[PDB]
Amino acid sequence: SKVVYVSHDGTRRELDVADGVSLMQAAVSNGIYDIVGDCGGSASCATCHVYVNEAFTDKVPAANEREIGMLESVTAELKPNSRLCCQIIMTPELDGIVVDVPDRQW
Ligand code: FES
Protein backbone atom coordinates (compact mmCIF):
# COMPACT_ATOMS: atom_id res chain seq x y z
CA SER A 1 0.00 0.00 0.00
CA LYS A 2 1.16 3.54 -0.76
CA VAL A 3 2.85 5.71 1.87
CA VAL A 4 4.42 9.10 1.18
CA TYR A 5 6.95 10.63 3.57
CA VAL A 6 7.49 14.34 2.97
CA SER A 7 10.81 15.67 4.21
CA HIS A 8 11.03 19.05 5.91
CA ASP A 9 12.21 20.54 2.60
CA GLY A 10 9.23 19.13 0.70
CA THR A 11 10.90 16.12 -0.91
CA ARG A 12 8.44 13.26 -1.37
CA ARG A 13 9.64 9.73 -0.66
CA GLU A 14 7.02 7.20 -1.79
CA LEU A 15 7.05 3.59 -0.64
CA ASP A 16 4.85 0.53 -1.18
CA VAL A 17 4.44 -0.76 2.37
CA ALA A 18 3.14 -4.25 3.15
CA ASP A 19 0.42 -5.03 5.69
CA GLY A 20 1.72 -5.30 9.23
CA VAL A 21 4.81 -3.17 8.71
CA SER A 22 5.03 0.01 10.81
CA LEU A 23 5.71 3.32 9.12
CA MET A 24 8.92 3.57 11.15
CA GLN A 25 10.13 0.20 9.90
CA ALA A 26 9.35 1.05 6.29
CA ALA A 27 11.11 4.40 6.64
CA VAL A 28 14.34 3.20 8.23
CA SER A 29 14.60 0.11 6.03
CA ASN A 30 14.39 2.37 2.98
CA GLY A 31 16.89 5.03 4.00
CA ILE A 32 14.41 7.68 5.16
CA TYR A 33 16.71 8.54 8.01
CA ASP A 34 15.03 11.81 8.91
CA ILE A 35 13.03 9.28 10.97
CA VAL A 36 15.38 7.73 13.57
CA GLY A 37 13.49 5.04 15.48
CA ASP A 38 16.04 4.90 18.30
CA CYS A 39 14.08 2.75 20.76
CA GLY A 40 13.29 0.18 18.11
CA GLY A 41 9.56 0.81 17.80
CA SER A 42 8.11 0.43 21.30
CA ALA A 43 7.01 4.03 21.89
CA SER A 44 9.89 4.81 24.24
CA CYS A 45 11.99 7.47 22.47
CA ALA A 46 9.94 9.91 20.36
CA THR A 47 12.45 9.88 17.48
CA CYS A 48 9.98 8.60 14.87
CA HIS A 49 7.81 11.72 15.16
CA VAL A 50 5.75 12.61 12.08
CA TYR A 51 2.77 14.83 11.32
CA VAL A 52 0.03 12.67 9.81
CA ASN A 53 -1.80 14.40 6.98
CA GLU A 54 -5.09 15.86 8.20
CA ALA A 55 -7.13 13.77 5.76
CA PHE A 56 -5.79 10.55 7.31
CA THR A 57 -5.67 11.18 11.04
CA ASP A 58 -9.13 9.71 11.63
CA LYS A 59 -8.22 6.58 9.63
CA VAL A 60 -5.37 5.72 11.98
CA PRO A 61 -6.06 4.10 15.38
CA ALA A 62 -5.55 6.74 18.08
CA ALA A 63 -2.43 6.89 20.24
CA ASN A 64 -2.28 4.51 23.20
CA GLU A 65 -1.24 5.52 26.72
CA ARG A 66 2.43 4.90 26.03
CA GLU A 67 2.46 6.97 22.83
CA ILE A 68 0.59 9.87 24.46
CA GLY A 69 3.24 9.91 27.16
CA MET A 70 6.19 9.82 24.75
CA LEU A 71 4.72 12.52 22.52
CA GLU A 72 5.29 14.90 25.44
CA SER A 73 8.99 14.55 24.60
CA VAL A 74 9.05 15.26 20.87
CA THR A 75 11.78 17.73 19.99
CA ALA A 76 10.08 19.31 16.99
CA GLU A 77 6.85 21.25 17.55
CA LEU A 78 3.95 19.14 18.80
CA LYS A 79 0.96 19.56 16.48
CA PRO A 80 -2.56 18.09 16.71
CA ASN A 81 -1.61 15.59 14.00
CA SER A 82 1.68 14.54 15.64
CA ARG A 83 2.20 10.78 15.92
CA LEU A 84 5.07 8.40 16.61
CA CYS A 85 5.08 6.47 13.35
CA CYS A 86 6.34 3.24 14.91
CA GLN A 87 2.74 3.12 16.20
CA ILE A 88 1.18 3.35 12.75
CA ILE A 89 0.82 -0.13 11.26
CA MET A 90 0.15 -0.23 7.53
CA THR A 91 -3.12 -1.61 6.16
CA PRO A 92 -4.83 -1.33 2.76
CA GLU A 93 -7.23 1.17 4.34
CA LEU A 94 -4.34 3.58 4.83
CA ASP A 95 -3.32 3.43 1.17
CA GLY A 96 -2.09 6.84 0.06
CA ILE A 97 -1.39 8.13 3.55
CA VAL A 98 0.97 11.11 3.60
CA VAL A 99 3.10 12.01 6.62
CA ASP A 100 5.36 15.05 7.04
CA VAL A 101 8.67 14.46 8.79
CA PRO A 102 9.85 17.27 11.11
CA ASP A 103 13.34 18.72 10.76
CA ARG A 104 14.58 17.03 13.94
CA GLN A 105 14.02 13.93 16.07
CA TRP A 106 16.72 13.81 18.71
S1 FES B 1 10.78 4.27 17.36
FE1 FES B 1 10.88 4.96 19.51
S2 FES B 1 8.94 5.94 19.87
FE2 FES B 1 8.85 5.23 17.77
Curated annotation (Swiss-Prot):
Q: Name one GO cellular component term.
A: cytosol
Q: From which residue to which does the signal peptide run?
A: none
Q: Which UniProt keywords apply?
A: 2Fe-2S, Electron transport, Iron, Iron-sulfur, Metal-binding, Transport
Instruction: Note how many cofactor molecules are bound and how.
Output: Binds 1 [2Fe-2S] cluster.
An example of a GO molecular function for this protein is: electron transfer activity
Q: Which GO terms describe its biological process?
A: P450-containing electron transport chain
UniProt KW Iron keyword: yes
Q: Where does [2Fe-2S] cluster bind?
A: 39, 45, 48, 86
Q: What function is annotated for this protein?
A: The oxidation of camphor by cytochrome P450-CAM requires the participation of a flavoprotein, putidaredoxin reductase, and an iron-sulfur protein, putidaredoxin, to mediate the transfer of electrons from NADH to P450 for oxygen activation.
- Record family assignment: Belongs to the adrenodoxin/putidaredoxin family.
According to the record's subunit comment, the protein's assembly and interactions are: Monomer.
By what name is this protein known? Putidaredoxin
Q: What is the lineage of its organism?
A: Bacteria, Pseudomonadati, Pseudomonadota, Gammaproteobacteria, Pseudomonadales
